[PDB]
Amino acid sequence: KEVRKVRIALASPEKIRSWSYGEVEKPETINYRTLKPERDGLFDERIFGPIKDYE
Amino acid sequence: PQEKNSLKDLVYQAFLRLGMEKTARLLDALKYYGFTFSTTSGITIGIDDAVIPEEK
Amino acid sequence: YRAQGVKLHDKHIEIVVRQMMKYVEVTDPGDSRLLEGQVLEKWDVEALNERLIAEGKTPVAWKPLLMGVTKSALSTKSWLSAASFQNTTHVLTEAAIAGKKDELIGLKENVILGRLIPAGTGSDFVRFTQVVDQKTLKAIEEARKEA
Amino acid sequence: MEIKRFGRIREVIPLPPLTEIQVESYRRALQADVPPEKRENVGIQAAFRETFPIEEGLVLDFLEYRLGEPPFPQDECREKDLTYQAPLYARLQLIHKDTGLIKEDEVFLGHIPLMTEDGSFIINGADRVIVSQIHRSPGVYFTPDPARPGRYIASIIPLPKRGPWIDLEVEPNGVVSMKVNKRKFPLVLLLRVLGYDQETLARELGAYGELVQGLMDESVFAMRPEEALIRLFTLLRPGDPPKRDKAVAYVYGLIADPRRYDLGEAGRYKAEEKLGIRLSGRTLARFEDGEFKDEVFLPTLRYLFALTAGVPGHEVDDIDHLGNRRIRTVGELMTDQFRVGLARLARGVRERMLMGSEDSLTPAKLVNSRPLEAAIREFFSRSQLSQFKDETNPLSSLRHKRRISALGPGGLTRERAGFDVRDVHRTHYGRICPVETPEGANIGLITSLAAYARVDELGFIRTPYRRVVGGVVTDEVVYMTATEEDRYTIAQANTPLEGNRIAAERVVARRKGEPVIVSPEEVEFMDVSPKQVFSVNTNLIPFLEHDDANRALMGSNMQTQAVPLIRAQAPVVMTGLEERVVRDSLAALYAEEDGEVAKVDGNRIVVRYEDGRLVEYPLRRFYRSNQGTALDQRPRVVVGQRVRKGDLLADGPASENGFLALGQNVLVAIMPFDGYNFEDAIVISEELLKRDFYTSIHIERYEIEARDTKLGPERITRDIPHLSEAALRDLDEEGVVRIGAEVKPGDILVGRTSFKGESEPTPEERLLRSIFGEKARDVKDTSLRVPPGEGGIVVRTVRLRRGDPGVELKPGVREVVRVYVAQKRKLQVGDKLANRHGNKGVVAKILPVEDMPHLPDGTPVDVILNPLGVPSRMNLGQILETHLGLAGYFLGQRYISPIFDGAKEPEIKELLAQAFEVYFGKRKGEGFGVDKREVEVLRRAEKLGLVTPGKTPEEQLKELFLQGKVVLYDGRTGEPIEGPIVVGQMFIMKLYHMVEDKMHARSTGPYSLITQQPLGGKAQFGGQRFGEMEVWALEAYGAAHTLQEMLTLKSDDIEGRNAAYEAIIKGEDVPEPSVPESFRVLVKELQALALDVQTLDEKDNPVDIFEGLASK
Amino acid sequence: RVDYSGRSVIVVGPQLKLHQCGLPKRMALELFKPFLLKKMEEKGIAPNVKAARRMLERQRDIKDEVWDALEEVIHGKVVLLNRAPTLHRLGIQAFQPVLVEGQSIQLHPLVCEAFNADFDGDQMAVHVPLSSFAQAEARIQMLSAHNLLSPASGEPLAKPSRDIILGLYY
Amino acid sequence: SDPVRQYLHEIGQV
Amino acid sequence: AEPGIDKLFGMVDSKYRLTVVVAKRAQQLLRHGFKNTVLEPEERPKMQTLEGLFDDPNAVTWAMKELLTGRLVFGENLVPEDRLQKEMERLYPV
Amino acid sequence: FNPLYVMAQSGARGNPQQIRQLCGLRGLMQKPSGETFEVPVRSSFREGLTVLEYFISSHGARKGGADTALRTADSGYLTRKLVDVTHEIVVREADCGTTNYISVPLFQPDEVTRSLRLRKRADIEAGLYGRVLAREVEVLGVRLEEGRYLSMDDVHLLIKAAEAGEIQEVPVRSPLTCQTRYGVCQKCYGYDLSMARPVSIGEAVGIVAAQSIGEPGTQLT
Amino acid sequence: PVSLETPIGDEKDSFYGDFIPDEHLPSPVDAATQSLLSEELEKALSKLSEREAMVLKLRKGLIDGREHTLEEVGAFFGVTRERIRQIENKALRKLKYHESRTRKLRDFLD
RNA sequence: CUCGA
DNA sequence: TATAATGGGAGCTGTCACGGATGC
DNA sequence: GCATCCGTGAGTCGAGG
Ligand SMILES: [Mg+2]
Ligand SMILES: [Zn+2]
After folding, report:
1. Taking Cα atoms as reference points, which of C77, H114, D82 lies closest to residue A6?
2. Name one GO cellular component term (chain G).
3. I8 → chain D, closest CA residue
4. D831 Cα to the center of ligand 1, angstroms
C-alpha cells in the first residue's frame, strides 16, 4: 500500500509494551573480555535481535 | 554606444522575438566579440588615468 | 528594495503576505462547535460557514487576523513541516496530544519522507501523462477493435 | 643589486622584539632562572601561594618549587610526538600542630610545557601557539542606566572566575540596591555588616541631594553587625540554616577571601585611581579582629551618588577604551589553569588527610598530582586559545604569536558581540591594527598587536611617543597607556623638522583622538612612526596610503597564506621591514659574533669565532611544517669568508639574503585578455613553469599501526595475499616502501595483514572455492595506500616496534610506521595568486610564450592582470608598485618605499626617465629606428590625449613611458595593442589554496553509522552535502525526480543505492526509490520519546515501513 | 550528504558554449564510475566489471582507451553545478560537461552573475543526476541556456558584463 | 530546585 | 540550448508535462533497445567515435528528437498501463 | 576614452563615488558612534592619504564589514522563515474562478500633498508586468481584454494612457485574491517571469517567492 | 569508551561519531559483486545436467541454506553415496573444464 | 575553534 | 562485620525578541 | 490593564585539526 498520511499520537504503557521485545533489567552493555552483549542489558540479542545475519 | 542597459534590453527583446535558443547563440556571439575586442582595445590602468581635475 | 535598486515583482511579496493573512479569530461561535477567541484557518471557517448556511444554521462570526511569517509557519496544519521548522518540542507535544494527521500537502513533509514532491514533474496535473508511438497505438487500437 | 630608499622620517627607535608578548609573559609565569627564595608572588609561584597552606596530619605547607631540565630535546619531541616539557618538583612539609612533628619532602608534580625560543609550544609533537585574549579590565565602572536617564549603574568587576560581578543601582523607590549572583538586596544591610553606623553614613554621604535618604533604614541600624550578617545570609541563602560561623564563612568567602575574590593588580590600580582611595589588598573588604572592614564599597557608593547628582569631576566609563580593556597573555592563562588544577589537588589532599593513618603521613602520601597534570594537559591540548600553529611561512608564525582574541574561555560568546566590541576604537591608535582582522563572522573579534605596541605588566597595551619641549623633539621615548595618552596633544610623525625643531607653525595633532591643528608651543608629544599604527603584516604593504582599507585587509591577511618557493624573491618594492621579519621569526641563521667561516655544507656550517672556539650550526633540511610546507635552511656563506656579528649564515624558508621572500617578482601587463582574466581570473606564461617560478615543496605524513587483536595480530609485512610482484615492487623486505620510490594513487606505502573476522562462507564462496580448489587465506590485505590525488617521492621512514629500546606504544599496539612523501608542486590552473594590495585570483589559463603580449625588444610578459579589478577596489598601490617595478626592471635595482614615507610620483617619473634612456637608447644604438606599429600606437595615443602632438616619436614614447605605459605587440598577430599598456614588475605570491588539495570526487563510499548517509570530507572519501537551500533550488526548478534521487538512492536508502549501483553496472535504468533510512531512524527516536508515529494509507489503515521486522 | 558528487576550484572557461562546463577528467572518472565500468565491459577494455574496477583502482594501470570510453559515457548527459550559498534556484544549474586536463572546473562567464561566482578562489560542487527522469529534468528545466531571465524580476540574468561590455562599448 | 539541598532539609527534619 | 526547445515548450500546456513525456519515452527506448524508435535511419542521432559515427547512446536526446517529429502521441489515459507494456513487449521483445 | 570613465559609463566597472575617491577626494568620514568627523579627507587615493586620515577611515571600513557580517545571517534566517511559510504554495490549477482582484495604482500622493503624481516606471512594471487583467480595459483606442497577460508593451501602453489621463488604476488578478486551496491558479499568478509567458501548472511559486525576496537581502543597507 | 557526541571543533560544529564509517552493512559494490557472483554461478551450473547441478547445490548449500551429506543427497536422488560422490566429482570436473575455457569465474576469487 | 567562498 | 564518627559546595557572564505564565 | 523572567532562535558550504 501507499503511504498517504502520517499520524502522531501519545503512546500508552500498553502500546509501549506492545512495541517492546523484552525488558532491559541490567545497566550492562557488553562483556569486558568477550566484547559481546550482556544478558538482559542494553545490547542483549535476546531482546533487540542478532548481531550477525541469521545466527 | 552599446553599454549594460542597451545590451540587456537587446537580450530581452531577442528573447521575446526569437526564443531562447537563438538568444543563447546571440549571447555567445556577444561574449566572443566582446572579449576579442576588449583584448586589443587598449584598456589599461595607470596612475595618470586617475585624472585630478583643476576645479578641485 | 527600490531604494537599493533591486527589481522585485510584487507577486512574490503578495504570496508571502497571503500566507500572513491565512488565519482568523472567532468572535462568535453561532451554531458551531467553535469557541470564542479560537484561531483557525480562513478557508476552514468559510467552509464551515457555507456548510452551516446550506444547512440553514447561524454562521460563525469571525475577525481577520495578521501574524508574522514565523508564527504563521508554526501555526500550519502540517506537523512535520512545523516541527522541522523550529519549536520542535511544542509542535510535537501539541500534535501528539491532538492525534494530528499530516496529509503531506506541502513540499517539506514529502522531502522528509523522501517522497516525490507535489510540484513540477511530480505534480498530479502532469505525472500521469503517457507517451506512445503510432505503431504501438494502432497495434493497441486493433486489439480494442476486435473485442 | 642596488637598493634605493625613499622617505625623510628618521625612526628614533627600532621595532621591539616582535615575539616578546609570548616569551616575556611565559618567562614571567615560570620564573625558572630566578633562585627560589628570590621569586616574586606572581605566576605559578602565586598559584602555589594561593593553594597552600592546606589545613584540617593537620597542616601541609609549601616551601618552594623547582623546574628540572627537559627529558627530551625539541626535535626529538616533534619526532616521537612528545610534549616539550620540564619536570616540576615542589618542596612540601607536613606539620602536626599537637605533636609538633615536621615531615619534609620534595614531591614530583608532573611536567609543564616549555616555550621554545620563538614563542611557541610543542604539544604531542605538534607546534601550538597560545593566543592572547582581550577582556574587560577588572575595576570599578560607572555606566548610564539604559532604562533610566539621569541614573547610573556602578559595577565592581574582579578577575575572571575570581569573584562575582557586583552591581550598585539607585532603585525607582529611592533605595540603593546591590546585585550579586542575581540577587537584589538593600545595600544598607551590607553596609551595616561592614560596621557602618547611621552617623558615619550621614556625615559621609549627606552632601548629595537626598540620595542618602534612600540609604536610611531604621530597621537595619536597630541591629548590630551580627544580626545584620545573619539577615544577609538568609537573604542570600534561602533554606540554608542561618548559623553564625556559616554566615561569616560565606560572606568572607564572597567579599574578603583573597583565595576566592581577586581584583587583579590592574583592577586594584584602576579602582584606586577611579575612586581616589588606596587598597591594602585586592578584595572588597577584610576580616580584621573578628569583624569585617570596608575597603571599596563606601567609596564606590560615594562616587555613584556624586555622579548621579552632577558633582564635577565624575564621569561614566567608556568600556571599549583601551584603558579599560586588557590583555591576558599565555603566562596568565596557563597560570589560571595551573591554579585550578592546584585547587583540585588541594581538595584531594584534605580528602586524604581525613583518611589513613594519622601518624604515618608523608607529603608524598597526601599528594596526588593527577588533577594538576590533567588541568595543564587540558589547557595546552583542548583550550580555545591553544591553537595549531600557522607556519605556512615564517611571517605566519610571527603573526599568529601576535594575535589578540576577544573570544575564548571567559571571553565574548559570538552573536552576543555587537558593533561596539568589533569597532575600531580611537584608542586602538598605535596599539591594535585597524586593518588586520578577518573577513566574516570573526571581524573585529580577532585582531593584531600594532608593530611598536607592548603589553605592560598590568596587561594594558602601550605605544611609544617622543617627548616635545618648546617645539623641540627629544630622543626620549615614553610608552603610554591610552589613559595616559588622553592627557596630551600629540603631533603626527610626518611633522616637518629642521634638526630637532618643529619647522611648521601649523602642526597636525591629536587630543583624545580628535584631530586638531596646533602651534608647536602646544605640542607635548609626537608619534615615532607611521609604522606604529599598523600590524607587522600591514606594514609590509608598500604604497599603503593609496589602497582602500578593505583591500589592504586582504593583502595583509593573505601574506600569511603565502607558500615558500624554491626560488623565492624579496619584493622589488619593499617597505623596509622585510629583514626584521626574517630575523625575529628565527627563520634564518646569523653569526653569533665576529669570526671566520671554517666549513660550509648543505647540512652544516662551522664558524670559528674571535674567541678561537669552533661553533657548528646544523642546518634544518627539508623538514615538514604543520601545514606541510618545506622548512629548510640554505647556507649563504662560503669557506674562509669573514663574518661580523649578526651577519647572515643561512637563509630559511621564504628568505632571500635575509630579506622576507614570500613570492616572485614578475613582469605584468594590465589589460583584458580574451576573457581568460575575466572576474579576477589570471593569465600566466608557461615561461614561469619553465624556470620554476612558483614551484613549492610539500611533504605529507602517512601513518599506520599494527596492533594485537582477539583474532590474532596485525603485522607489517611484504607477504600480502593475492598481490603481484608489480604491486610489491617498491616495498622493502619488511613491507615498507623504499626511500626514493615514486608513489602514485593506489600504490602501497606500508604492507599490512589482518586476520579475517570469523568467516561463515556463503554457499557461493564454498562452490567457487571447490571449483578453484584454493584454501581461503587466514589473513587479508589491510595495507596503507596512497589516497586519490596524492603521491610523490618517499623521503623518510620511521618504524617504532614494541620490545625495542626507547620504545613503548599505547596498549595493544605492536608497531607504528610513518612514511613521509615529498612532492614538487608546479603552478597550475586553479592555483591562487595574490599581491600585497588585496588583488587575488586563480590561474585560469597558462599560455605558451609565443601567445604572450611582448615588448618591441621581444620580451614577453609573465602575467596578465585585468584592469577591471581596480576601480571598484580602489587599491591603486598595486599600480604605483608596477610603475616603480618598470623602472626597476631596466635600471636593475630595488626600492624601499616606506608607508606614508614612500616614493612620490615625481621621483618615480625621474626613475622612469632614467629607465627609458636604457630601454630606448640601447635600441637607437643597435641601429634601429622607430617601428611602424609604434607609429600607429602613437597616433592612437595622440587621439587619447596621452602624448603631445608635434613631438618626435621618441619624445612621445618617452611621455608614455613616464606614464608607465609601453607599446605592446599581440603575440598571436604581431600587431600592436591599439593603446599603450601599463607594464611593470609586480610582487605576486602563490597562496596555500592549491587546487591539488581541493579537487575531490566520489561515486560511492563509506556511510555513517546511525544515519546511513555518506560521510563528509575528502579524507573519509566523503560526499557533498546537499543542504536545505540546495533542496530549495531543486524544488523551485520543479525537479522532483532529481531531488528524490538525492534524498533516496544517492543518500541513505540502502536497498535503493545498492539496486541503483547494480542497475547502472548492468546498463539498466535506476529503480524506483523507497524509504530513506533516516526517516526510520526518526520514527524510532520518536517512539523512544513515547510518541506513536504512524504512516497510514488513504483508508487510514497503518502501513508498515519496517516490513514486519519490528512487529511481534 | 550524497553520492555521485564532487567539488573543485572554479575557472573562467571563456571558450565554452552557454550550455557547457569544463569537467576535470579524474573527477568525471570518479563521478561516472559505474557507467564507465559498464561501458568498459561493453568494449574490449575489460572482461568483466570487477576487473575494470580493479583496473581503475591504480592510476598507473589506467590506459588511454578508458578515457575515450568515458567520452562515450558522458555523451549528451549533464551535470549539476552548485555554488554555495545557494540563494535562489540559479545557484544550481545544469551543464553539458566537456572533459579537460587539469583539476579545475570551467564555468561559463555569462552564468557567473547568477551564481554570484567569480575567480578569486571560489569552489563549486558537481552532482550527477542518475535516472532518465533526473537527466530529462536537468536538460529541460535546469539547463543554463534555458534559464536566461530572472524569476524574481523578469529581466535578463544571463547578459553581457565586465570585459564583454567593455569590448562592445569600445 | 536543588535536590541535594532539599534532601539535606528533609534529613534536617529528623 | 536543446535543439528545438522552443517548439517543444510550444507542444505542451505545462513544461513539466514535456519533461514527463521525454523521460517516459526515454525509458521506453532503453527498455526496448531503441528498436521501437519512430526515427528513420537518416534521422538517427549520431555520436563521433574514434572509428566513426555510431548511434547516440543517449535516450533522452532520442526522445526529444522523436517528439519533434509529431509521430509520438501523448496525453492522459490513452491506454491501460499493462496493455501498453504487453503490446510493446509483443512488438519489440527484450 | 579614459579607462576609469569608459568602465564607469559602459557599466563594466565602477560607480561615480569610487571614481571620485580615486580622482577627487575621499571625503567625509564617520566616527565609531555614527557621528561624522568635521574635517573630511581632502586627499584622493591617487594623492595618497596621511596615516591619520587612513586611521579615521578605518572606523567606517570596519563598521561596514561588521554590518555585512551581521547582515548575511539575518538574511539567511529570513529566507528560511519565508521558505517555511510559503513552501506548500504551488500552481495547482489553471483558474480558481474568482471574480476578486486587486487594483494597481498608477499614481501616488506627493509628499507635498499637492496632488497625485505618476509613479516611477519600474514600480509600475513591478506591479503590472506579466499579470492577468481582471476586467476589460479600453485606452487610447486599444482593447486590452479581460484575461489578457500584460506584456511589457502592454504595461508601457498603460503608462502612456495614464499620462494622457485615461486611467488611474489597473484591475489585475493576484495571489492575494486567488481562491485556489494550498496554492494559486495560473491566471492569478500570471507570467513565469523567467520565461516571459504564462506560468506552468506545477510550478513551486512559493519557494521561488521566498528565494526572490531573500536573495538580495545582503544588498539591503 | 569515548562519547560519539564528543565535539571536534565546537559544540555547533562536529561530532566524533561523524568520522566513523559503518563497517557492518555491505557497500553497493560488495552487494553487486555478490549478485554478479550468484548470477555467474547459476550461468555456469546451467551447463551441467540438472542432477549434477542440483547435487552440487545441495552439497554446497545453495538450496535450503545448508550442505547435505552424501547420504542425504544420495537418498534424495535414490542412489548410493559412492554414486552421488562420483556424480559430484564429474560435475566439478565439467565445471573446471568450462571455467578453464571461459575464465568467467576467476575474478571473483579475489 | 582557525581558514576559504 | 563493632572506638567514634551524624546537613554539599559549586558559583566571570558584554545579545535579543517573543509567548507566557504572572504578578505586580 | 501593565513591567517581569523564561525559553529560543540567530546564512552556507567547504578546509584544517
Ligand atoms: Mg569569490
Ligand atoms: Zn486564482
Report:
1. C77
2. DNA-directed RNA polymerase complex
3. D382
4. 14
Residue D105 CA, ligand 2 centroid: distance in Å = 91
**Residue D53: how many other CB atoms lie within 10 Å:** 14
Using the CA of H80, give the nucleotide whose C1' is nearest.
L11
Q: State whether E169 and H9 contact (CB < 8 Å).
A: yes
**What whole-number distance in Å separates Cα of residue E106 and Cα of residue E129?**
19
Q: Is residue D371 a contact partner of residue D345, using CB atoms and an 8 Å limit?
A: yes
Residues in A closer than 8 angstroms to C95, CB to CB, are 8
Enumerate the domain spans of chain G.
1-94
Assigned fold of I26-106 = Arc Repressor Mutant, subunit A (1.10.10)
Between CA C88 and C1' L12 the distance (Å) reads: 22
Phi, psi of D403 (to 5 degrees): -80, 150
Our measurement of CA C95 to C1' K21, in angstroms, reads: 21
- In sequence order, the β-bridge partners of residue D156 are D140, D166
Which residue among E11, E86, E121 sits closest to D993, beta carbon to beta carbon? E121
Q: Residues D687, D850: contact at Cβ < 8 Å? A: no
Q: Which helix (H) or strand (E) holds D288?
A: strand D285-288
Q: Does the C-beta of E122 come within 7 A of strand J? A: yes
CA-based nearest residue to D552, from D561, D540, D562: D540
For cell 520518536, name the residue. D1086
Sheet holding D54-55, edge to edge: D54-55, D59-67, D85-95, D102-113
Query: Which residue of G5, G11, G18 is the best one to mutate when testing the B interface, meaning the one whose CB has the most B CBs within 10 A?
Result: G5
Tell me how the structure was determined. X-ray
What is the Cα–Cα distance from D744 to D500, expressed in whole angstroms? 67
Distance in angstroms (rounded) separating the CA atoms of residues D747 and D793? 12
Task: Give the Cα separation of D257 and D594 in Å (integer).
Answer: 57
Measured CA to CA, the distance from residue E92 to residue E94 in angstroms comes to 7
Cβ–Cβ < 8 Å for E111, E144: yes
Whether residue D53 has a cis bond before it, omega within 30° of 0? yes
Nine-digit cell string for D587? 627563520
Query: C118 near C124, Cβ under 8 Å?
Result: yes
Residues (12-51, chain E) with CB within 7 Å of strand J atoms: none
Q: DSSP secondary structure string, D647-684?
A: -EEEE-TTEETTEE--BEEEEEEES--TTTTGGG-EEE
Q: Is the CB of D1029 under 7 A from strand L?
A: yes
**3-state helix/strand/coil string of D866-928:** CHHHCCCCCECHHHHHHHHHHHHHHHCCEEECCCCCCCCHHHHHHHHHHHHHHHHHHHHHCCC
Resolution in A: 2.5
Q: Is the CB of C93 under 7 A from strand L?
A: no
Instruction: Using the structure, give the distance in angstroms from the CA atom of D993 to the C1' atom of L15, rounded to a whole number.
Output: 9
Task: In whole angstroms, give the CA distance from residue D652 to residue D435.
Answer: 28
Q: Which residue has the cell 472567532?
A: C26
CA distance D353 to D58: 7
Chain L bases near protein CB atoms (7 A cut-off) = 8-17
Residue D23's alpha-carbon distances to D129, D132, D266, D582, D590, in angstroms, are: 11, 12, 21, 17, 20
Chain I CB contacts of E51 below 8 Å: 107
- Rounded CA separation E135/G61 (Å): 10
The three cell numbers of residue D324 are 579599560
Contact I107, E47 (CB under 8 A): yes
Task: Verify whether the Cβ–Cβ distance D1069 to G23 is below 8 Å.
Answer: no
CATH classification number, G1-94, choose in 3.30.70.260, 3.40.50.360, 3.90.940.10, 3.40.50.720:
3.90.940.10
Give the max Cα distance, chain B. Answer: 52
- H-helix or E-strand containing E69? helix E65-73
